[PDB]
């Protein structure tokens, strides 16, 4: 995982099945300690990106130009952004988005 002080930045990477990467939206999800899974943002193969209301421009998504990787760039991180972050496609519910291999993000106060 990655850890920063409040106000810091972090980039996450999601590598996902090439067949999925080429055809389906990829969603980023997160789950804070003791809280439920929530959808953060999505990106489609044409780089249309959606964001949940709490992102407020701080997190942005892009696709690698050569590999099956999506990037989540996070700026102006705050302690309540501490969570495990996950990526998934073809979810049947938001809960499923946090069922795979996630990465721990920790934001510590200044």
């Amino acid at each position: 995982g990655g850890s920063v002080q409040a106000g810091g930045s972090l980039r996450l990477s999601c590598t996902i099945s090439d067949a999925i990467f080429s055809r389906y939206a990829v969603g980023w999800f997160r789950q804070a300690p003791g809280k439920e899974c929530e959808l953060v943002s999505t990106i489609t193969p044409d780089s249309t990106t959606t964001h949940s209301d709490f992102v407020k421009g701080r997190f942005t998504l892009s696709r690698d130009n050569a590999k099956n990787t999506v990037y989540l760039q996070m700026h102006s991180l705050k302690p309540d952004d501490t969570a495990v972050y996950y990526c998934a496609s073809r979810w049947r519910s938001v809960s499923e988005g946090c069922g795979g291999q996630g990465t721990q993000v920790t934001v510590s106060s200044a």
């Binding site: 990477s13 999601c14 996902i16 389906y24 990526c87 073809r90 499923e96 069922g99 795979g100």
Partner: peptide
């Protein structure tokens, strides 16, 4: 069904 990717720090 759902396909999970692998999330890491870039």
């Amino acid at each position: 069904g759902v396909v999970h990717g692998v999330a890491t720090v870039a």
